[PDB]
Amino acid sequence: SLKSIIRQGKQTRSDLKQLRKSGKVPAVVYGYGTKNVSVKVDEVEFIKVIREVGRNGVIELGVGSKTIKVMVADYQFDPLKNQITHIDFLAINM
Amino acid sequence: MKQGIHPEYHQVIFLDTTTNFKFLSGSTKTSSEMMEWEDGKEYPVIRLDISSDSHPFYTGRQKFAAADGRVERFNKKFGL
Amino acid sequence: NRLKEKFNTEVTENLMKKFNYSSVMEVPKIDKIVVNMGVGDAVQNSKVLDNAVEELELITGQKPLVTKAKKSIATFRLREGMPIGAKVTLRGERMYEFLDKLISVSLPRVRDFQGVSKKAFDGRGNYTLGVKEQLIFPEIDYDKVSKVRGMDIVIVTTANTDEEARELLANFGMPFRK
Amino acid sequence: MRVNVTLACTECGDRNYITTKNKRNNPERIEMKKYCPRLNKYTLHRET
Amino acid sequence: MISKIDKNKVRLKRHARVRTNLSGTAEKPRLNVYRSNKHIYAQIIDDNKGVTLAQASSKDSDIATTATKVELATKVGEAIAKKAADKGIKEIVFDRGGYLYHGRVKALAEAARESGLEF
Amino acid sequence: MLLPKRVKYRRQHRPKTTGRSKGGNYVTFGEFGLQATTTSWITSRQIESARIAMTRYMKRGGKVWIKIFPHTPYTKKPLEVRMGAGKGAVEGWIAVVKPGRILFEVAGVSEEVAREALRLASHKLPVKTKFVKREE
RNA sequence: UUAUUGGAGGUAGAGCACUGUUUGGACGAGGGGCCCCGGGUUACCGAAUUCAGACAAACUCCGAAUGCCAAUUAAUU
RNA sequence: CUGGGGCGGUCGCCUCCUAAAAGGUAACGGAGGCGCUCAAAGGUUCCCUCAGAAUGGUUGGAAAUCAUUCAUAGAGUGUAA
RNA sequence: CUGGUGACUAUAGCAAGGAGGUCACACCUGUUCCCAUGCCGAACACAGAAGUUAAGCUCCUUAGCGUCGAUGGUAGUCGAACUUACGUUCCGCUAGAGUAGAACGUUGCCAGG
Numbered sequence: 074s075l076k077s078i079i080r081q082g083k084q085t086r087s088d089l090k091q092l093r094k095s096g097k098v099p100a101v102v103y104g105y106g107t108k109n110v111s112v113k114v115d116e117v118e119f120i121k122v123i124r125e126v127g128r129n130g131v132i133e134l135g136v137g138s139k140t141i142k143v144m145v146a147d148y149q150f151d152p153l154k155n156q157i158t159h160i161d162f163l164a165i166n167m
Numbered sequence: 168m169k170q171g172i173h174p175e176y177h178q179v180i181f182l183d184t185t186t187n188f189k190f191l192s193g194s195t196k197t198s199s200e201m202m203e204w205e206d207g208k209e210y211p212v213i214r215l216d217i218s219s220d221s222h223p224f225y226t227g228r229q230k231f232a233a234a235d236g237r238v239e240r241f242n243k244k245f246g247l
Numbered sequence: 248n249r250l251k252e253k254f255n256t257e258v259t260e261n262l263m264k265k266f267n268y269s270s271v272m273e274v275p276k277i278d279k280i281v282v283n284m285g286v287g288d289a290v291q292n293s294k295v296l297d298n299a300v301e302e303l304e305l306i307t308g309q310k311p312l313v314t315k316a317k318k319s320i321a322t323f324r325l326r327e328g329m330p331i332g333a334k335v336t337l338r339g340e341r342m343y344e345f346l347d348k349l350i351s352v353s354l355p356r357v358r359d360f361q362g363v364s365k366k367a368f369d370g371r372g373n374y375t376l377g378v379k380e381q382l383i384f385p386e387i388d389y390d391k392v393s394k395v396r397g398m399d400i401v402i403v404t405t406a407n408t409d410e411e412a413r414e415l416l417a418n419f420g421m422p423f424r425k
Numbered sequence: 426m427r428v429n430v431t432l433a434c435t436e437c438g439d440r441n442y443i444t445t446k447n448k449r450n451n452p453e454r455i456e457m458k459k460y461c462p463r464l465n466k467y468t469l470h471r472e473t
Numbered sequence: 474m475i476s477k478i479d480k481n482k483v484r485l486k487r488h489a490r491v492r493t494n495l496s497g498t499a500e501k502p503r504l505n506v507y508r509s510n511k512h513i514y515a516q517i518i519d520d521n522k523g524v525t526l527a528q529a530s531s532k533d534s535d536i537a538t539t540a541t542k543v544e545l546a547t548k549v550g551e552a553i554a555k556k557a558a559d560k561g562i563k564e565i566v567f568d569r570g571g572y573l574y575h576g577r578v579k580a581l582a583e584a585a586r587e588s589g590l591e592f
Numbered sequence: 593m594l595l596p597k598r599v600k601y602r603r604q605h606r607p608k609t610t611g612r613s614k615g616g617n618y619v620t621f622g623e624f625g626l627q628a629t630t631t632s633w634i635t636s637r638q639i640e641s642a643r644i645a646m647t648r649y650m651k652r653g654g655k656v657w658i659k660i661f662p663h664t665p666y667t668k669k670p671l672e673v674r675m676g677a678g679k680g681a682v683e684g685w686i687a688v689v690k691p692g693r694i695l696f697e698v699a700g701v702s703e704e705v706a707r708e709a710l711r712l713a714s715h716k717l718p719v720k721t722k723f724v725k726r727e728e
Numbered sequence: 729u730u731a732u733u734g735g736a737g738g739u740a741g742a743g744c745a746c747u748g749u750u751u752g753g754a755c756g757a758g759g760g761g762c763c764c765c766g767g768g769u770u771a772c773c774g775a776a777u778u779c780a781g782a783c784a785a786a787c788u789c790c791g792a793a794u795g796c797c798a799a800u801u802a803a804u805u
Numbered sequence: 806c807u808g809g810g811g812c813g814g815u816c817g818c819c820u821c822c823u824a825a826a827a828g829g830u831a832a833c834g835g836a837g838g839c840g841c842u843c844a845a846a847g848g849u850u851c852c853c854u855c856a857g858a859a860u861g862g863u864u865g866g867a868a869a870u871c872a873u874u875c876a877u878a879g880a881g882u883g884u885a886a
Numbered sequence: 887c888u889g890g891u892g893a894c895u896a897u898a899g900c901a902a903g904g905a906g907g908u909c910a911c912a913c914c915u916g917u918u919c920c921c922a923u924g925c926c927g928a929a930c931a932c933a934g935a936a937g938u939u940a941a942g943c944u945c946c947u948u949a950g951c952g953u954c955g956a957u958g959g960u961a962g963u964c965g966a967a968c969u970u971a972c973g974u975u976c977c978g979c980u981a982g983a984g985u986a987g988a989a990c991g992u993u994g995c996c997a998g999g
C-alpha cells in the first residue's frame with residue numbers, strides 16, 4: 074500500500090506533456106494535516122497499488138521525506154489514450 | 168360596517184313549537200308576534216316546526232323500526 | 248353570545264383537556280365563515296345573480312360581494328370580469344349568530360337530513376359545507392324564491408389539524424354523519 | 426385613436442393644442458383644461 | 474389553519490419602497506417614525522453618514538405620561554423638534570416608516586411642524 | 593429512424609466538427625461499448641443499420657443502448673438549381689461525433705459476442721472505432 | 729507602442745438552473761381487461777416524480793483568451 | 806435589385822440570430838412584426854401581489870366562483886422580438 | 887444585552903431541534919371618536935389592557951438543502967514555428983464542472999438595560 078512520489082515545481086504545458094510521456098502522472102495532495110503539494114507518481118506503480126488497496130483503499134504516499142496515508146479522492150482519465158492524466162490524493166485524519 | 172348598505176338586522180327569539188325551546192339569535196326576519204326573554208327585553212318571535220332539539224337525527228330517536236329480514240318476515244307471516 | 252359563551256367556557260375547557268394545550272392561545276377558534284354562491288346562470292341572465300344576492304343578503308344580514316370571473320372559458324361561455332357569483336364573509340358576533348342558527352334551525356330544516364359529512368375537511372383544519380337549497384335557511388321564503396339554489400359555507404378554523412377542528416365543531420353541536 | 430383633434434381656448438378661441446381621440450369612444454367634442462399662452466392661465470379648451 | 478401576518482414586516486416592505494425616493498442629507502436629515510401598539514419613536518437621521526442626530530419617544534421618561542396615544546404622539550413630535558433646533562436642524566424630510574400618514578403618525582409630524590421643523 | 597419529434601428551427605447552421613467529444617466518453621449503461629476515434633456526421637440511417645446488425649448477432653439476448661441521437665436537421669437544395677434564393681429543405685437528421693464519443697453500449701452478452709457485434713456495427717458507420725469496456 | 733490599474737460586454741469552452749431536443753433505468757394520481765354501496769393487482773400508467781447519460785446560431789446557473797474604452801500613469805517612439 | 810436576362814420574389818420602418826464577449830458588419834442567409842392603439846391603457850398619491858398545483862365544497866363537469874396550504878415567478882407588462 | 891435605523895454579492899438564506907416574556911415587541915380586548923371594508927374593525931384606523939408566550943419575534947445548536955469555494959489538472963485561447971493534418975509544437979493567459987474547504991453572518995450610529 075506504499076508508492077513513492079516526487080515533488081514538482083511550476084510547470085509549463087510542455088513539461089507536463091513530457092511527464093506523461095515518461096509514464097509519470099501529475100497529482101496533488103490535499104486534506105487534513107497536509108498543505109496542498111503537487112506530486113508526480115509512476116502510472117504503472119499507482120495502478121498496481123490501487124489494485125491491491127482497491128479504489129477507496131488507503132495508500133501510503135512517500136511525499137518527500139514524510140509519508141502520508143492518502144486516498145484517491147478523484148482521478149482524470151483519457152479514454153482514447155487509456156492513460157490517467159491526473160490524480161487527486163485526499164489525506165485522511167487518523 | 169358601512170352605513171345604509173346592509174339589511175336591517177335585529178335580535179329575534181327562535182322558538183321550537185314542538186319542544187317549546189327558545190333561543191335568541193340575530194336575523195333580518197321581522198315578526199309581528201313578540202315574546203319576553205330572560206333579560207328584561209321583548210323580541211319578535213320566529214316559530215320553528217323542527218330544531219336541533221326536535222329533529223330525529225340530533226335526538227337519535229328512531230321513529231320507525233328497522234325492516235325485518237327475509238327469514239324473519241317469512242316466519243312471522245306464516246307463523247312458522 | 249350563546250355560542251360564543253359556550254366556546255369561551257365549555258368548549259375551551261374540553262379542547263385544552265383533550266389536546267393538553269400549554270396555553271389558552273393554543274386552543275382552536277373559528278376565524279371566519281364565508282358563504283359562496285356560484286351563479287354561472289348569471290351569464291345567461293343577469294337577474295339570476297341579482298336574485299341570489301338578495302337571498303344571501305337575507306341569509307347573512309350583510310350585503311354580498313359580487314365575484315367576477317378571473318378568466319374567460321368558452322365552454323362556460325364565460326368572459327373575464329363578468330359577474331358570476333356572490334360571497335359574504337361573516338366575522339365576530341355575526342359569525343356566531345349565523346353558525347348557531349345553522350346548527351339550530353337551518354340544518355334541521357334540510358330535507359332528508361342524515362347529518363353533515365365528517366370527511367369535508369381540507370386537511371388543514373378547515374371545513375366546507377355545501378347546502379343543496381337556500382330554502383333550508385329560515386329567513387328565505389318559498390314564495391319569494393323563484394329558483395332554489397345551493398350555497399357553499401366555508402368554516403375557517405385556527406386549528407392546525409382536522410381532528411382538532413372536528414372537536415371544535417362537535418363541541419358547538421354541529422351534527423356529523425359518522 | 427382614429428381622428429386628429431384641435432383644441433381651442435374657450436375664452437380667446439386660440440387653437441393652442443392638437444391631439445387625437447377615438448370618435449366612436451368619444452363622439453362628443455372633447456374638453457380639457459390647458460395652459461393658454463395669451464391668457465397666461467389654464468383655461469378650458471374644447472375640440473373644434 | 475389560517476396564517477396571521479406580522480404587521481411590522483408588512484410595513485417594513487412599505488417603508489423600503491418609500492425609502493427609495495426618500496433619504497436624509499446633513500442639510501435635510503430624515504425624520505423616521507416607528508410606531509408600536511403602545512409607543513411611538515422618532516429619530517432624526519443623516520443617511521449619507523448613517524448617523525442619528527436626535528431622538529424622542531413615548532417610552533422616554535420625560536415624554537412618558539398618562540395620555541391617549543395620539544396625545545403622546547404630539548408630545549413626541551414637539552420634543553424631537555426642540556432637540557433638532559438645538560442641533561441647528563430646521564429642514565427635514567419626514568419618513569413615515571411605511572405607516573399611513575394618519576392619526577398618531579400625523580400628530581407627531583404636525584407637532585414638529587408647529588414647533589418649527591420645516592417639512 | 594431516430595429523429596426529434598419537433599424542433600424550434602428546421603433550418604440550422606451546420607455543427608462544428610473540429611475538436612474532441614464534450615461528453616459521453618465513458619460506458620455508463622452497459623458492460624461494453626463502441627468508441628469513435630474519428631470525427632464525422634452520423635445519420636439516422638447509419639445508426640439504424642448499425643443497430644440492426646448488432647442486435648441480430650446478439651440475438652436480442654443482450655441489451656443495446658444507443659448513446660448518440662441525431663438532433664440537428666440538415667438541408668439540401670433541390671437538384672439542378674443555381675446558388676441563392678434561400679436555404680434548401682430539410683433532407684436528414686445527424687449527430688456530430690468527435691473522437692472519444694461512445695456510439696453504442698452493449699450488455700447481457702460475453703465479451704467475445706460483444707466484440708463481434710460491435711465489429712459488425714462499426715463497418716456500417718463512417719467513423720473509425722475501437723471496442724471499449726467500462727473502466728474502474 | 730508597451731507596462732500598470734479600473735471598467736463595459738456574454739463569444740470560445742462549458743453547463744443543463746430556464747426554453748426546447750433526447751437515451752436507459754426505476755416509480756406512480758387514478759381508474760379501465762382483471763379478481764369486491766361490500767375489494768383488488770402480470771396494459772395504459774398517458775399526470776407527475778426520481779436516478780443516471782446526452783444535444784442547441786436564435787438555450788444559459790457559468791464563462792475565458794483576445795479585442796475595446798479609459799487613466800493630472802511611466803518607458804520608448 | 807437579380808449568382809446572365811425574363812418570369813417569380815423584393816423595395817420604408819421595428820426586433821432577434823448570422824455578428825467572431827465594445828460599436829459596426831453582407832448574401833434572393835435563418836425568424837417575426839409595423840403603417841397602430843389608449844381620454845386611460847396618461848400624471849400623481851395611497852394601497853396591493855402572480856401563474857400553477859394539492860385538498861375540501863352545490864348547481865359545477867379537467868377547468869366558473871369560495872377556502873386553506875404550497876408556490877420566486879414558470880404570471881402580467883395594449884401590440885413582434 | 888435589547889430595540890430603532892443604516893452598510894454589505896445568502897459565508898448573511900432555508901429547513902429542523904431547543905430555549906425565552908416585570909420592561910420591550912406581539913398576540914390580544916373593544917369600536918365611542920379619527921379613520922376603514924368594491925362584503926367583513928380580517929386589514930386599515932383609533933381607544934385600550936383582561937389574558938398569553940401559543941404564534942410572530944429574539945436567542946442557541948446544526949452543514950440536509952441553498953450559498954461561498956480553492957490547489958492541482960483539463961477545455962479554450964493571444965502570440966510564434968510548423969503545416970493543410972476534423973492538425974502538431976512552444977510560450978503566455980486560463981476556465982466551466984468537480985474536489986478539499988468556508989459558512990447557521992459581519993458591522994455603523996442613536997436610545998434604553
Ligand SMILES: [Mg+2]
Nearest residue numbers: 608740741742
Ligand atoms: Mg459551443
Ligand SMILES: [Mg+2]
Nearest residue numbers: 824827828829
Ligand atoms: Mg457586437
Ligand SMILES: [Mg+2]
Nearest residue numbers: 795825826827
Ligand atoms: Mg467582437
